[PDB]
Amino acid sequence: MWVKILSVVGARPQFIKAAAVSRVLRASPGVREVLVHTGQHYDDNMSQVFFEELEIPDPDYHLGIGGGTHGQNTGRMLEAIEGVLLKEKPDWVLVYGDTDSTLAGALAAVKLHIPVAHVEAGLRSFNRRMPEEINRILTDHASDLLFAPTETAVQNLLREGIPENRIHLVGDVMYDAALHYGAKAERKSRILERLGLQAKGYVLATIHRAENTDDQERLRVILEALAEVHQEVPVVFPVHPRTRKRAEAFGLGSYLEKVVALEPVGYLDMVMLEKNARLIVTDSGGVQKEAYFYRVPCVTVREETEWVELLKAEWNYLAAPQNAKDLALTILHRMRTKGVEIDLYGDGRASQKISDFLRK
Amino acid sequence: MWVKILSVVGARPQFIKAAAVSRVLRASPGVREVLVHTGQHYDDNMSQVFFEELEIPDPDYHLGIGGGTHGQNTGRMLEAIEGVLLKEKPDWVLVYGDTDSTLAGALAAVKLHIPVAHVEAGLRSFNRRMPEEINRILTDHASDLLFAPTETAVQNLLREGIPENRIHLVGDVMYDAALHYGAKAERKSRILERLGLQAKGYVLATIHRAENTDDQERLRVILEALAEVHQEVPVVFPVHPRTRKRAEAFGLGSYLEKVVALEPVGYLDMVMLEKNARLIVTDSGGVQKEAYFYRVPCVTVREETEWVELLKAEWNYLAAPQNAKDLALTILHRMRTKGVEIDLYGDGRASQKISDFLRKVGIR
Ligand SMILES: [Cl-]
Ligand SMILES: [Cl-]
Ligand SMILES: [Cl-]
Ligand SMILES: [Cl-]
């Protein structure tokens, strides 16, 4: 009708962010939306339940690309995305996060003189070996509008010579989504019932990174710690399939009967879990932020984390799997902590502010 | 034991820079060179001549890509190059200048953790609507090693957050190439013989650009002026084929009979003309640089140039083609001027520097 805003997405978090943006857009008449998924129409990365439960729109296009090298995936995505852009001639192109899809969308649009906005801009790990570091840098420098989630992000962009007037501090739209899904789980998740658990009466653990799941001592130290912690507090562990088959491969599948081990759980139930736990123990970077979003203290069993500002506001604590005694104690300590009451990633209406800056 | 150095080239200037680099590398031990052309293997005699005359190495690969959109060309180049990198496993990829080929080469390499060097880094037009400005920005950011041609390019790179330890001021490789092709012309070219001219005894003119060629007022001005200059000093005018069409159709064909008008000349003959000219008149960016390289005063018949530094150093001069008598006058004035004796684009050893670094042998 009056403005076309086309979203490119090719990973689950990008769909989640695009849907949070789209909740705001869909309430203004005369925004027409187009959703372009770079991947396979019925990719098994995702499920009926991911779409229904997390309220993800049906893409208008599926480009069918993935499973290649960075060159094959990115090259094909650049051609195919360009084609859709030429066909749809949208006013705005929104790209999200820092995958190959992000970069394809931006490079496709900028050569066509179609304005590109990068949702989640300015994040730097300062290690160009990560494909995602290259993706975010190049997306940032190709985009017209840079929607940063933090002040560090903003400063990262300025230090790189991007003009201030292309940079907008809007917060992290994954916080908005955490709140939306948070409310929804309270309304619908029953996983507390079926497990027979009490809000603020359990510890939740996820472990699925290499640095911990491969090495055998580490996975001892980790599961030996969770074992001992189960004694004081019910520990709930939804085990990445891959982390299960690594433990059954040092026979360690005995340190998993003391804890309520579970087979990976529905997305809403997992939110329920996260937001009602007294502590979350993990090596996932995503769960570290979800912890902060729901104001549940976090221990990070990793020897390194990426979200240093959660550490600095004492919502997250670094505890490297050395031995079980040392680790179970620091788990127990942190379980009775909290962090500073500061908003780190916006106020939960990043979507609003993005939308306002566009429909301008 | 060797270093393997793979060049990605897609336009003529890149081939020329690459071949500049390859002339230095061939004298060195334990170097393997791979040349990847992203375009087509051409059989014709024209292209054969370019490779022969300008001493361009025979590419190892021709990926056969071009002729589509930005996304098509770039995305296909990205995949085909990566395919080549996955087979050859070079220690370095060199990319050159600012075409889609440049950018595809860099993006291919960085995601495979193959170090990339951008020959000709840091140039900025500050206009992101230009596709080539996007290419150089993202290339420079994708790159491990930035071979900048000028101090201005260095500051451009520093201002965008790029660490000093990745930036090397080495000069313009095309300067090294101009010197080599200049020597070759002096050796081989008989064009001055044939035209019965003498060094410093003519003016060379080349008009290429649409804005001049496709406009009666502007081409009238230029041809009227060259014909007037030709009275004082012979004017040699290799006329673009398109340029001639327009002239005849506009009814200015007679003014071409009034200067030494030629059909387009060989690459080396053209080098010879430029370097032995008393003055050059042009609207070509390349030619303006070559005038400076050969230390011949230049006049740019255009409302602006890329190369402001040549204006500042008084090697080049803007004379917009508004008035035939004015452009004549300007030409005859500038023809006995020179610029400041200073290097702007290196000392003609940019190649050596580049080579020295990639071989981990240190820059001199
Ligand atoms: Cl992402
Ligand atoms: Cl094109
Ligand atoms: Cl080039
Ligand atoms: Cl790298």
> CA-to-CA distance for A272 and A235, rounded, in angstroms?
15
**Kind of pairing between the strands at A31-37 and A61-62:** parallel
Q: Which of B62, B141, B208, B333 is catalytic?
A: B208
Interface test with A, best of B132, B136, B138 (most A CBs within 10 A): B138
Classified by CATH at the fold level, domain B3-178+346-359 comes out as Rossmann fold (3.40.50)
- Torsion angle of the four alpha carbons B76, A85, A98, A17, in this order, in degrees rounded to the nearest 10: -150
Closest CA to A265 of A13, A29, A53: A53
Residues in chain A with CB shorter than 8 Å from the CB of B110 are 128, 134
Under an 8 A CB cutoff, do A78 and B71 touch?
Answer: yes
- Torsion angle of the four alpha carbons A328, A268, A276, A260, in this order, in degrees rounded to the nearest 10: -40
Quick one: closest CA in A to B114, which residue?
Answer: A129
**Looking at residue B72, what DSSP letter applies?**
H
Phi–psi pair at B324, nearest 5 degrees: -55, -40
Only one residue has tokens 């019910």, namely A234
Distance from CA of B138 to the nearest CA of A (A): 6
A67 is in an annotated binding site: yes
With an 8 Å Cβ cutoff, is B79 touching chain A? yes
Assess contact for A154 and A122: CB atoms under 8 A.
yes
Assess contact for B210 and B242: CB atoms under 8 A.
no
Under an 8 A CB cutoff, do B142 and A142 touch?
Answer: no
Sorted by sequence, the CB contacts under 8 Å of residue A175 that are 6+ apart come out as A293, A345, A346, A348, A350
With an 8 Å Cβ cutoff, is A161 touching chain B? yes
Give me the count of residues in chain B.
Answer: 364
B66: left (phi over 0), alpha (psi -120 to 50) or beta: left
CATH annotation of A181-335? 3.40.50.2000
List CB-based neighbours of ion ligand 4 within 5 Å: A 128; B 113
A240 is in an annotated binding site: yes
Single-letter code of the amino acid located at A270: M
Under an 8 A CB cutoff, do B82 and A76 touch?
Answer: no
Say how many Å lie between the CA of residue B114 and the centre of ligand 4: 6
Which ligand does the CA of B103 lie closest to?
Answer: 3
**Kind of pairing between the strands at B203-206 and B116-119:** unpaired
- Portion 49-78 of B in contact with A at CB < 8 A: 69-72, 74-78
What is the maximum span of chain A, computed from C-alpha positions, in angstroms? 64
Token pair in block for residue A162: 């991007």
**Looking at residue B11, what DSSP letter applies?**
S
Say how many Å lie between the CA of residue B280 and the centre of ligand 3: 23
* HEC secondary structure over chain A: CCEEEEEEECCHHHHHHHHHHHHHHCCCCCEEEEEEECCCCCCCCCCHHHHHHHCCCCCCEECCCCCCCHHHHHHHHHHHHHHHHHHHCCCEEEEECCCHHHHHHHHHHHHCCCCEEEECCCCCCCCCCCHHHHHHHHHHHHCCEEEECCHHHHHHHHHCCCCHHHEEECCCHHHHHHHHHHHHHHHHCCHHHHHCCCCCCCEEEECCCHHHHCCHHHHHHHHHHHHHHHHHCCEEEECCHHHHHHHCCCCCCCCCCCCEEECCCCHHHHHHHHHHCCEEEECCHHHHHHHHHHCCCEEECCCCCCCHHHHHCCCEEECCCCCHHHHHHHHHHHHCCCCCCCCCCCCCCHHHHHHHHHHC
Token pair in block for residue B355: 């080579």
* HEC secondary structure over B178-246: HHHHHHHHHHHCCHHHHCCCCCCCCEEEECCCHHHHCCHHHHHHHHHHHHHHHHHCCEEEECCHHHHHH
3 state DSSP class of B30: coil
A42 is in an annotated binding site: yes
Query: Is the domain defined by B179-335 classed in CATH 1.10.490.10?
Result: no
Closest CA to A15 of A94, A114, A90: A94
Residues in chain A with CB shorter than 8 Å from the CB of B157 are none
Residues in chain A with CB shorter than 8 Å from the CB of B72 are 79, 82
Distance from CA of B246 to the nearest CA of A (A): 31
CA dihedral for B156, B162, B163, B165, sign (positive or negative): negative
Distance from CA of B134 to the nearest CA of A (A): 7
Assess contact for B81 and B38: CB atoms under 8 A.
yes
Assess contact for B104 and B77: CB atoms under 8 A.
yes
A57: left (phi over 0), alpha (psi -120 to 50) or beta: beta
Residues in chain B with CB shorter than 8 Å from the CB of A111 are 70-71, 74, 131, 134
Say how many Å lie between the CA of residue A191 and the centre of ligand 1: 28
Residue A223, Cα to own-chain centre: how many angstroms? 25
> CA-to-CA distance for A19 and A37, rounded, in angstroms?
13
Assess contact for B148 and B345: CB atoms under 8 A.
no
Say how many Å lie between the CA of residue B120 and the centre of ligand 3: 9
Assess contact for B306 and B132: CB atoms under 8 A.
no
Q: Would you list the domain boundaries of chain A?
A: 3-180+346-359, 181-335
Classified by CATH at the fold level, domain A3-180+346-359 comes out as Rossmann fold (3.40.50)
B119 DSSP β-pair partners: B96, B147
Token pair in block for residue B194: 């044939």
Residues in chain B with CB shorter than 8 Å from the CB of A110 are 128, 134
Phi–psi pair at B32, nearest 5 degrees: -105, 130
A245 is in an annotated binding site: yes
Say how many Å lie between the CA of residue B117 and the centre of ligand 4: 11
Only one residue has tokens 């953790």, namely B113
Which ligand does the CA of B132 lie closest to?
Answer: 3
**Kind of pairing between the strands at A61-62 and A92-96:** unpaired
Say how many Å lie between the CA of residue B86 and the centre of ligand 2: 27
With an 8 Å Cβ cutoff, is A113 touching chain B? yes
Instruction: Let me know if B333 is a catalytic residue.
Output: no
